[PDB]
Paper text:
GES-type BLs, the target of our study, represent a unique example of this family of hydrolytic enzymes. More recently, because of the documented carbapenemase activity, as well as a structural characteristic shared by other serine carbapenemases (i.e., the disulfide bond between Cys69 and Cys239), GES enzymes have been included among class A carbapenemases, along with KPC-type BLs.
In the work presented here, we set out to identify more soluble inhibitors of GES-5 carbapenemase with a higher ligand efficiency using a structure-based virtual screening approach against an in-house determined crystallographic structure. As the receptor for docking, the in-house crystal structure of apo GES-5 was used as the target (resolution 1.55 Å). In the case of GES-5, the oxyanion hole is formed by the amino acids Ser125, Thr211, Thr230 and Thr232. The binding sites of GES-5 and KPC-2 were structurally very similar (Cα-rmsd between 0.433 and 0.462 Å), and the residues interacting with imipenem in GES-5 were conserved in KPC-2. The major difference between GES-5 and KPC-2 was the substitution of Ser170 and Ala243 in KPC-2 (KPC-2 numbering) with Asp166 and Arg238 in GES-5 (GES-5 numbering). In KPC-2, flexibility of an active site tryptophan was observed (corresponding to Trp99 in GES-5). Therefore, two different structures were used for docking, one containing the rotamer found in GES-5 and one containing the rotamer found in KPC-2. The binding sites of GES-5 and KPC-2 were very similar, especially at the level of the targeted oxyanion hole.
Author numbering: 19 to 286
Amino acid sequence: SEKLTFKTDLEKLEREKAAQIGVAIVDPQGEIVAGHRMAQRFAMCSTFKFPLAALVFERIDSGTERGDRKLSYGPDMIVEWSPATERFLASGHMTVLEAAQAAVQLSDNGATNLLLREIGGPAAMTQYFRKIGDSVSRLDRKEPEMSDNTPGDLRDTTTPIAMARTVAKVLYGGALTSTSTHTIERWLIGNQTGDATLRAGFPKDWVVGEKTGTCANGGRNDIGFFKAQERDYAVAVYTTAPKLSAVERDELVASVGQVITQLILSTD
Ligand SMILES: [Br-]
Ligand SMILES: [Br-]
């Protein structure tokens, strides 16, 4: 069956690359299509910036936040990998929406932390996962320490299945207004950081949007959505490959994209 070949193809990559691959594919209602180590915890790394932007839009939707509110900051908000926050530093602020878009499409850490400083910190991020029916994902720290991915640490983790269901809830399951949903969907399609990861392994006519993440200790992740054969899906991929190079980890995730494609093409 297509599900056995999916598993054995992922196990081959896992053996040969000395890696662990967690994957969940769900339909728009969160129904499982396929998975592998789907309920093992993995560090979210930057993937949590997608749900963080969803949280931001829920606050906009409810009138407790305004997308063009200016958020002021100084040099101390600049951390590793803050390309847009660095550019906007002299101006002295980014708006809520500028920071959210940079968090999503550039994985900007300063922008992420600026939003966390506005929405009530890691506790409030965790509270939003619970609100949207995810009892698993948890943010405990800001960037970059939340990406430390110390082996066995449950802080700052999710599972493939919980996060795939979270993605589905946000894009398909009515969590946000239609306006807010469409905005975040387009940001994911226009993501700047995902060209060499999952989307590299999908057919070119599939509509795909995703958010990547990289952790210390070999974490490399990609979550998002794809539309194939008039069928919509949500997908979460988390991998741990301590001995691969960064480029090899990209290749690993693209290879997982290929394995997913083969399952979907085989699926009645
Ligand atoms: Br599992
Ligand atoms: Br303002």
